[PDB]
Amino acid sequence: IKVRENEPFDVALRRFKRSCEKAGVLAEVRRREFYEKPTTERKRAKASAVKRHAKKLARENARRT
Amino acid sequence: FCRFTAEGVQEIDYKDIATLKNYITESGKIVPSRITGTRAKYQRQLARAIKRARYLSLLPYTDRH
Amino acid sequence: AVVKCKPTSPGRRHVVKVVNPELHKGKPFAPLLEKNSKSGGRNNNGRITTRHIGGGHKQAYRIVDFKRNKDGIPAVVERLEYDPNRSANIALVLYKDGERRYILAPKGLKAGDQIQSGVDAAIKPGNTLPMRNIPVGSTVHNVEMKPGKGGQLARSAGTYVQIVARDGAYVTLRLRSGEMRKVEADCRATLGEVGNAEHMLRVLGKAGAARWRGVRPTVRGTAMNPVDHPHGGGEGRNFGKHPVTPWGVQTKGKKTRSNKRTDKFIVRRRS
Amino acid sequence: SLSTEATAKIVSEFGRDANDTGSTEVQVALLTAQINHLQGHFAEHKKDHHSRRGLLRMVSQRRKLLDYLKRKDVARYTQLIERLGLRR
Amino acid sequence: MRHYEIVFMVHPDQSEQVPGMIERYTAAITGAEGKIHRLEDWGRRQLAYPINKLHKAHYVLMNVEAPQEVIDELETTFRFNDAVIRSMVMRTKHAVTEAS
Amino acid sequence: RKQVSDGVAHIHASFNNTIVTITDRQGNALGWATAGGSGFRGSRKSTPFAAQVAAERCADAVKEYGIKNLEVMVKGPGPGRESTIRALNAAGFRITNITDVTPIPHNGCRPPKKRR
RNA sequence: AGGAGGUAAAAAUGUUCA
RNA sequence: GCUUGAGUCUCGUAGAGGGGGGUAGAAUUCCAGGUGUAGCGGUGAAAUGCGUAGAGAUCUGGAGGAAUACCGGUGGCGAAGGCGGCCCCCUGGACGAAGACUGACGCUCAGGUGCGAAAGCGUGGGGAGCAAACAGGAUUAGAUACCCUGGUAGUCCACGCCGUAAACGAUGUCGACUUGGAGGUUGUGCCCUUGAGGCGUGGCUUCCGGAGCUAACGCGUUAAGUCGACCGCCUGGGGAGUA
């Protein structure tokens, strides 16, 4: 949260910001309450994730690349 | 990738802030099991301890005091 | 508890009785009683100053101890009595040295509960102690306004005040009306809310029910003639004027608070 | 809740010995002790519907066992009921 | 009887008067057959965040083994005592006598 | 004047504006500048370049106080947030440390449902 | 390979039958 | 009478299971004061609104009500509805372990009883945020809509009522049997903990798939497969789940 580096930085390099929250959750409580949509995007989240890894273990057709 | 008391049987303690700080990020947030490789069972005991330690102010609710 | 009567008669149709199956049924304690003649709203000059007051059932005044002077002496609740002069129930209490006194009945109080007053006392419903020994955020009632005065605020049925701040020698209390007022921390207070909190659910049902409470018919201004009320007049229900009292002072929204010497004690006005 | 020592009495009170606890008389006596114990929990609270389902489950379990005992041997049944104060 | 591990932070100023509190509580406890396990006083350490102002509070662990009617008076004493700040109790799980 | 030495820059970078306020260490404000104050009205108001001139116009107007070095505590998402700290550093101020104080609640209130 | 920030104000209607 | 049905006792296990009473931090609004100064807010753009009576921004303190970030995961528990900060008290159920015990007490179940999201209703409180209705500003051919500024009921609490949802794996309940694979989650036994373990034995559950089945899609040991027991329900569309 508090990046300093103290003396030889001369630049931001605040990687923690893109690595903790500061965009995800802030632009999440931005609006829309839903109360239920989280659940459907919860299941759709891994529905896409599990089908990607299912074909990751099944990409060996040939494709001739 | 790394394990814990699952093999070396023992219980998590809210008082032991030596090891409890190793399971939370410096910004006062609990780290998910997908990264620490912690067993789901102990993560729950871990989380209960972190929340108890925060009440006893042995841990930060957030680094921004 | 509340019991809606069965409509076996017009007038008994809408009656809702607040019955308490544990109040003493016999006669009150004689030594702590004195007569109380009604006035009818009339004063020294014999004129009716306040209207709609008169008639009603005869009621004897029960000397209720609000001051709470007995300190360091434990007492036990003998029984719960009915007080016609008040909105809440009163509890006959017997002291350790053989002195009986009537005190307001707090919420959770049964015959046999032990209470006491003084700076020594603990924190329990019924105990009376100075407000500087009471934890901020507590719920008290029968609060004194001046040290040794007696107890003015929150003494009606189901009422209570709340301590919101204790800055220095002044306790900031949030009154029932929603008004925050500063009171010196040496004024005593009794823990808990006042009993008979179902009093508000009581529905009289009859016009006569109001008559024996001591209330009389209230005639509206529109029904009167110009010489009787600032409203009056009208050949067939005409109003057209501005809502005022029978004495011309604009009612329905005009503040009459003018003390100036007690404005120092008021933090946030009622709203 | 009837912990280990509380139930320890009832099994030895209605059974032939401290080992025989599976007997029908022992069970019904146990459920009765649990029900009367739970009347206080439902005396107040009045809104614990989830646990009340647990209560009503053992209420019917008692009834199913009582009817069994009556049909199997009415003699022991007539001894049991007045001993526990039930059966309207 | 149940086991408890009652903890309580106490005001820094009253820290010089904390021993009086520790033995006063145990008096009422052991008076009610409350066998004790620990008494791990951690001292006056730094706090994580401001608790009603004034950092670095004073921690005291008790770990008591007593019946429910004993500790209920204890919680009420914690509520009505401005010396102690933020006190909490926990369940059993076989009271310990170690771990500093 | 009073001549202060160290201060802290508060950058409130929200979705529409990026109001920058330079205060002292105690919190008392000295000078401030906004993207919407230096012209840039409308769509150009919610732009990182507008945040640049916001920092420049706040770089000055605090000259009478003469702040040597200052800290940066940014707040809100905003389109600026990182382009505004650049113009504030390249302006001639010594940046000691940068912190992020975005006020995220722990499910405090019910946010709007708006935007269909 | 792994996760996020950003990407459209407005555009109505079409006789029955083959 | 016996035991593989079913139930009980002993010891433990995980858990947003349910009820009651306290408590914590972040954040929003509001109130007072200090610093400070022309915007702020909003949008596709703009305006209403807020502001030179000095807002916004910022700092300190205080008052409140509601929801509990991270943990949190096609994870867990519950009959279903549904339930997550923490703590204590009262309390239900499921599951495993090695034995004993009772001895068909079992399954289903019209009528009946109970529980039953949200909205809504009655009584009394509470009221920050959000927000029907409503108002204004825009957009538009019109806009009593979408968007914006505000905003009442309501949303929250106690006690009663209503009894309805795409109350949905759209799949009634119980029991038996019928090739496998890959994971999660929760017990336990055995072997060397010889090192982030290995092989079995149960509960629950996610995904993929064979036989078979199906109109097809697909389901696929938690079956829509192969059978048995009982209950509910359907008989072309509309009229109408209405009179």
Coordinates of N, CA, C and O in Angstrom, one line a residue, chain C residues 48 50-54 207 210-211 214-224 229 231 246-247:
Chain C
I48 N -61.8 28.2 35.0 CA -61.3 27.0 34.4 C -60.1 27.4 33.4 O -60.3 27.9 32.3
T50 N -57.4 25.4 32.5 CA -57.2 24.3 31.5 C -58.5 23.6 31.3 O -59.2 23.3 32.2
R51 N -58.8 23.4 30.0 CA -60.1 22.8 29.6 C -60.1 21.3 29.5 O -59.0 20.7 29.5
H52 N -61.3 20.7 29.4 CA -61.5 19.3 29.2 C -61.0 18.5 30.4 O -60.5 17.4 30.2
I53 N -61.2 19.0 31.6 CA -60.8 18.3 32.8 C -61.9 18.4 33.9 O -62.3 19.5 34.2
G54 N -62.3 17.2 34.3 CA -63.4 17.2 35.3 C -64.0 15.9 35.4 O -63.8 15.0 34.5
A207 N -66.9 6.3 24.8 CA -66.8 7.7 25.0 C -66.7 7.9 26.5 O -66.1 8.8 27.1
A210 N -63.4 7.5 28.4 CA -62.6 8.7 28.6 C -63.1 9.6 29.7 O -62.4 10.3 30.4
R211 N -64.4 9.5 29.9 CA -65.1 10.3 30.9 C -64.6 10.0 32.3 O -64.4 10.9 33.2
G214 N -61.2 11.2 33.6 CA -61.2 12.6 34.0 C -61.3 13.5 32.8 O -61.3 14.8 33.0
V215 N -61.4 13.0 31.6 CA -61.4 13.9 30.4 C -62.9 14.3 30.1 O -63.8 13.5 30.3
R216 N -63.1 15.5 29.5 CA -64.4 16.0 29.1 C -64.4 16.2 27.6 O -63.4 16.3 27.0
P217 N -65.6 16.3 27.0 CA -65.8 16.6 25.6 C -65.0 17.8 25.1 O -65.0 18.9 25.7
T218 N -64.4 17.6 23.9 CA -63.6 18.7 23.3 C -64.3 19.2 22.1 O -64.3 18.5 21.0
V219 N -64.9 20.4 22.2 CA -65.6 20.9 21.0 C -64.6 21.6 20.1 O -63.7 22.4 20.5
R220 N -64.8 21.3 18.8 CA -63.9 21.9 17.8 C -64.2 23.4 17.6 O -65.4 23.8 17.8
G221 N -63.3 24.1 17.1 CA -63.5 25.5 16.8 C -64.4 25.9 15.7 O -65.1 26.8 15.7
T222 N -64.4 25.0 14.7 CA -65.3 25.2 13.5 C -66.7 25.2 13.9 O -67.6 25.8 13.2
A223 N -67.1 24.4 14.9 CA -68.4 24.2 15.3 C -69.0 25.4 16.2 O -70.2 25.5 16.4
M224 N -68.1 26.3 16.6 CA -68.5 27.4 17.4 C -68.8 28.7 16.6 O -68.7 28.7 15.3
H229 N -64.8 31.4 19.4 CA -63.5 30.9 18.9 C -63.0 31.7 17.7 O -63.8 32.0 16.8
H231 N -61.9 30.7 15.1 CA -62.3 30.0 13.9 C -63.8 30.3 13.7 O -64.2 31.0 12.7
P246 N -57.6 29.0 20.8 CA -58.8 29.7 21.1 C -58.4 31.2 21.5 O -59.3 32.0 21.7
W247 N -57.2 31.5 21.6 CA -56.7 32.8 21.9 C -55.9 33.5 20.8 O -55.1 34.4 21.1

